[PDB]
Amino acid sequence: CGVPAIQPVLSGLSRIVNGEEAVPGSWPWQVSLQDKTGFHFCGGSLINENWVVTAAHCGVTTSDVVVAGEFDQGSSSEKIQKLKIAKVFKNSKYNSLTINNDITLLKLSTAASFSQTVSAVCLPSASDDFAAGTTCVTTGWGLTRYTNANTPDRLQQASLPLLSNTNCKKYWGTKIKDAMICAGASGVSSCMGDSGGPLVCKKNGAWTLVGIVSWGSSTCSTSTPGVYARVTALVNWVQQTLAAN
Amino acid sequence: DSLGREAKCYNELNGCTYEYRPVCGTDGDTYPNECVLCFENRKRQTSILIQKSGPC
């Protein structure tokens, strides 16, 4: 876990008005949720060669497809993995009103083939503590400007720091829960089509699954923090379901 | 001769979820998702509906 064969290159463009385009194959655990139609509606992260972790508000069906090893979705010329889904294991504690406990585990029919471009993300430990002001990473195919209404063909990366529950409440107040973590308000935002993807904080060499894109500004406001499912507070459930399945 | 379909928000949230699920409004415009059309009706005080799902 959490070491790309292919090394990412995070430049100062990754930090301003709506990040940058990634080096192809640098976030191997990055997957795209798609229709039978080949329509990207969400992202996910690979934690094994069999399971994918996503956001529960995404509504993935067994009918949907997990596409591994993609850069340019606008291609038709990449070596990608279209894995089928066998079972969707959505948290029972997810609150649809509140968007709390927004984690869903997907069990694959076809195991994915770790490659140079496919690998898994390290999962944290509940005990884990990721300090506010920590600069992290979010990745996806979400809109660049809210005003684009056409998702990007190539993967993007934004550099953004975590926020204290206390300082997010300033912007969201009572909405912000315990199974929620915030990041942003720094010139970068997660937007429509980023949902289920990762918020990865580097821990001791490893890129570690710290958040899942959840929800945020209606309009992908770069001065407002974006909210993500808090992995450490939901990680034990990950272990448990993975174990019992 | 027919239908309609109104777009819904999460009220317990005054933000939107980040999924890409375009919806075609009765106005002839594409919304990234449904909560977006709702948040735009609310702020613009409009009453646009969902023609068809997916892009216009």
Lookup: tokens for A190: 């997660």
Sorted by sequence, the CB contacts under 8 Å of residue A130 that are 6+ apart come out as A124, A136, A162, A181, A201, A203, A208, A210, A232
Question: Within this chain, do residues A125 and A218 fall inside the same structural domain, yes or no?
Answer: yes
Q: CA–CA separation, A71 vs A153, rounded Å?
A: 8
Q: Which CATH architecture has domain B1-56?
A: 2-Layer Sandwich (3.30)
Which phi and psi (to 5°) does residue B34 adopt? -80, -40
Report yes or no: A15 and A222 within 8 Å, Cβ to Cβ: no
* Domain-located, residue A196: yes
Please name the amino acid found at residue A188.
Answer: V
DSSP 8-state code for residue A167? H
The first and second tokens of residue A105, run together, are: 């585990």
User: Residue A237 is encoded by which pair of tokens?
Assistant: 């459930």
The length of chain B in residues reads 56
Same domain, A112 and A216: no
What is the pairing mode between strands B30-31 and B23-25? Answer: antiparallel
Contact A43, A194 (CB under 8 A): yes
**Rounded CA separation A182/A138 (Å):** 12
Domain boundaries along the sequence of chain B: 1-56
Selection from A149, A130, A241 nearest residue A191 by Cα: A149
DSSP letters, A16-70, are SSS-EEPPTTS-TTEEEEE-SS--EEEEEEESSSSEEEE-TTS---TTSEEEES-
Contact B31 A146 (CB under 8 A): no
Which residue does chain A place closest to B13, by CA atoms?
A: A98
Indicate whether A87 and A199 sit together in one domain.
Answer: no
CB contact under 8 A, B15 and A218: yes
Contact indicator for A141, A40 with CB cutoff of 8 Å: yes
Among B12, B20, B42, pick the best mutation site for testing chain A contact (most A Cβ within 10 A): B20
Question: With b meaning 16 or more CB within 10 Å and e meaning fewer, what string describes A205-230?
Answer: eebbbbbbbbbbbbbbbbebbbbbbb
The CATH number of residue A69's host domain is 2.40.10.10
Among candidates B38, B53, B36, B28, which has minimal Cα distance to A37?
B53
Return the ∠ at Cα A172 (arms to A21 and A231), rounded to 5°. 60
Say yes or no: A158 and A88 in one domain: no
Q: Are residues A227 and A114 in the same domain?
A: no
Q: Does some domain include residue A61?
A: yes
Answer whether A26's CB lies under 8 Å from A8's CB.
yes
Residues A224, A138 share a domain: yes
Does a structural domain hold residue A45?
yes
Q: Are residues A127 and A209 in the same domain?
A: yes
Domain that holds residue A187: 16-27+121-232
Measured between CB atoms, which of B10, B20, B33 is closest to A40?
A: B20
Token pair recorded at residue A200: 């990865």
Q: What are phi and psi of A117, to 5 degrees?
A: -100, -5
Q: Is residue A127 part of a domain?
A: yes
Let me know if residue A74 belongs to a domain: yes
Residues A151 and A224 in one domain: yes
| Gap between the Cα atoms of B31 and A92, Å rounded | 29
Contact status, residue A72 vs residue A156, Cβ threshold 8 Å: no
Q: Are residues A240 and A191 in the same domain?
A: no
CA-CA-CA-CA torsion for A43, B19, A136, A159, nearest 10 degrees?
A: 100
- Is the Cβ–Cβ distance between B49 and B23 less than 8 Å? no
Q: Which residue in A90, A5, A8 sits closest to A44, CA to CA?
A: A90
Q: Is residue A6 part of a domain?
A: no
Which residues of chain B does A58 touch, with a Cβ-Cβ cutoff of 8 Å?
A: 19
How far is it, in rounded angstroms, from Cα A220 to Cα A184?
11
For residue B9, the tally of other CB atoms under 10 A from its CB is 18
Total domains present in chain A: 2
Which residues are within 8 A (CB) of A57 and not within 5 positions of it... i.e. 6 or more apart? A94, A96, A99, A102, A195, A214, A215, B17, B19
Parallel, antiparallel or unpaired: strands A51-54 and A180-184: unpaired
Among chain A residues, the shortest Cα distance to B11 is held by: A97
CA distance readout (Å), B56 to A33, B3, B27: 22, 16, 10
Same domain for A36 and A115, yes or no, is yes
Separation of alpha carbons A225 and A232, rounded Å: 19
State how far the Cα of B34 lies from the Cα of B17, in Å rounded to an integer. Answer: 9
- What is the least distance, in Å, from the CA of A243 to any CA of chain B? 29
Q: What is the CA radius of gyration of chain A?
A: 16
| A229 Cα to chain B: minimum distance (Å) | 12
Q: Give, as one character, the DSSP assignment of residue A233.
A: G
Rg, chain B, Cα only: 11
> By three-state DSSP, how is residue A41 classified?
strand
Residue A188 lies in a domain: yes
Cα angle at A60 between A100 and A93, to 5 degrees? 25
Chain B residue with the nearest C-alpha to that of A96: B10
Q: Is B16 on the interface with A (CB under 8 A)?
A: yes
Sequence letter at residue A10: L
Q: Are residues A90 and A172 in the same domain?
A: no
CA distance linking residue A172 with residue A201, whole number of Å: 23
Chain A contact for B2, CB < 8 A?
no
Whether A71 and A43 map to the same domain: the answer is: yes
CB within 8 Å of A174: residues ≥ 6 apart: none
